[model samples]
Target: SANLDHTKPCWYWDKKDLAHTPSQLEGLDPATEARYRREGARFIFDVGTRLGLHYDTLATGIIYFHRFYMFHSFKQFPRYVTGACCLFLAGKVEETPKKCKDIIKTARSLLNDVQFGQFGDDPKEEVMVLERILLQTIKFDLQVEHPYQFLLKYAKQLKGDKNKIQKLVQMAWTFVNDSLCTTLSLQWEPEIIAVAVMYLAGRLCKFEIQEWTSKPMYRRWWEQFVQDVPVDVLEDICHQILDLYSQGKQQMPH
Candidate 1:
């Protein structure tokens, strides 16, 4: 049965689908929807880290949170509760299980009184119910692929100075982490994200890999690994991440 196969292809959404998410359809402004998505992802990261979860587990939770919002409105489902459910489910899916109580406890410690009240009287039960809803929202597609693995694999094939390569990989890794805050996961596959972030990092560091042991058509380093991604697509992903940085800088009090 094709449905039973574990090696299914990565799910992706079209531009139209992203342009009008379920939250937007529910009458929420795009700006507010984007804000909620970003903050929710941050919440997942904070809780997952405090629980000593692995990077992959955090990433999976973030992806799940993003996908969940695509189908459900942020108004109907609070991002914090959905985030906790995603992280809890992600931990189990990633084979790094943590008790639901531990997740709720960590979240309780992180949020103030006002925010904690969103979980209702019984926070544990809240997360458990939302976890089931999240499962249905994502259609039980538990296997999530992220750019971290592809970034490392691509970095290893680069012929460059060892120190420079290390820095490039590190910067690319950071970009991948930040990219999770955006909807890039819903838009592109993991390999495309890996190439885009590596391209962005390479340009910033001025660390160009001039040649690869491949055909003449493969003029660029990334082309060796992914040939279908056009320059425009890579630039689009880069600009999305760059915009995130610019937005963050503007939000500072100074």
Candidate 2:
């Protein structure tokens, strides 16, 4: 009975009903923690998309939600409670502070356009579901060091008063946000993830981001990080970036 209904690798698809079972999230797979974090991001993003939240807001919420579990686990609360907590926390991080009623309204609006989540039949119920998780996850430390600040500061230093530079920073920020909510960078160094997120974001947005070459940025950032380590780390990080990018390209109908 030690492993009956053990927590699934990806909880996004198999959301547990937190109302009845709060202790089921105890055991964790240390080796695959990063992927779990990424999947959590995906789940948070999907839920945000339901509310039509701004991409930047979604990113902030995810970073807060993810950094919490990066140092903790989920058994503390149930799935809906966790989801609700994450959304509330994210809304505050995003500076929007959406009320539960508004969040429910947003979900109903988003789901009305699609056919997912039994909540679509009564999205208001999801608010209470979310409220419980928020209460349970309240103890988690959600602060995180993000790359957007670096991108903004670096871009300002490189491109003076170029409107395109600011624009690039914004686009790159969102792209990095999306990437962070994923796990491609968790396996690599923070510096590697930071630079790569900016590089990848710039290229994807084709703004000031286009000015930076992904291949060269990868090399440059790696060199900046590892003074004498083997090149495999850089290659592996790049490969992870590619995998995440490919997954991102598969946009869900929201």
Candidate 3:
């Protein structure tokens, strides 16, 4: 007798493959494309939060928005509508299911007239229409994973003081939230991102794990949870997130 398979495959791209995205191919500068992605993710989070969507739902939407841009350009499609569509679609995928009208209503209330105009006169239909486009753009891959759960799991396993571990987990959770604004999700797996977040948090908190076995060739705290990730990869992920903070500082009035 033949058995049925129910496994869902994950999609990961090599660094070289994502060095230049579809937006860049359309002559959009890298910095501008990054800005658009950051702003779009913020929009999704804002609207999703206002609509009472769960954190994972919001995250899935942001990932969908990012993945969509990998194959489409910002010039061809407005990020705002795409963002709204992603959030709407993500709610269904994440089983948080909010009405399309409610999402659009929340978006209208949040955005200014100029930004809201991108939805066209028929806002509901625009989002609904883009929903299919977004689905096809992602190649019908409906599943996504985030670093939040992995961070919690790994933090629980680490040997550290209770209070310090709690603080470390909290800081790492914040880092995971900030990571959504970058292309790190497309570049690395959730497990890698979780380990990197914990490593950065441990360094910042001056908290070290004392119980893991040390290897003569490689001895790192994060290795206990994930062995293959090197120091450079963790540092690179940290720097990308740190750059976001610096960018925010530059935007502030001096």
Cα-based lDDT for every prediction: 0.82, 0.49, 0.80
Question: TM-score for every candidate vs. truth?
Answer: 0.90, 0.52, 0.89
How big is the positional error of residue 206 in model 2, measured in Å on the Cα after superposition?
Answer: 13
TM-score of decoy 3: 0.89
Q: Model 3, range 104-135, lDDT digits (tens) per residue?
A: 88999999999999899999999999898988
Better by TM-score, candidate 3 or 2: 3
lDDT of 2 by residue, 1-254 (tens): 11233432222211112211222245544324445455556656777877777766766666555434532455542233344457766777667677777655554454434333544455556556654454354344344445556565555544334665566566656556656644433334344555565555455656454234334454443344336545454444445556555744321101
lDDT of 1 by residue, 132-244 (tens): 88888788989988999999998888764789889988999999999988888978889999999988998887866554333344365677888767889898889888878
Ranking by TM-score: 1, 3, 2
Clashes of 2: 6
Candidate 2 — what's its lDDT? 0.49
Off by over 4 Å in 3: 1-10, 14-16, 210-218, 249-254
Candidate 2 vs candidate 3, lDDT winner? 3
Residue pairs clashing, model 1: none
lDDT of 1 at 191: 94
Error of 1 at 36 (Å): 0.6
Candidate 2 regions with alpha-carbon error over 4 angstroms:
1-56, 64-85, 93-95, 112-126, 129-138, 159-171, 184-192, 199-235, 247-254
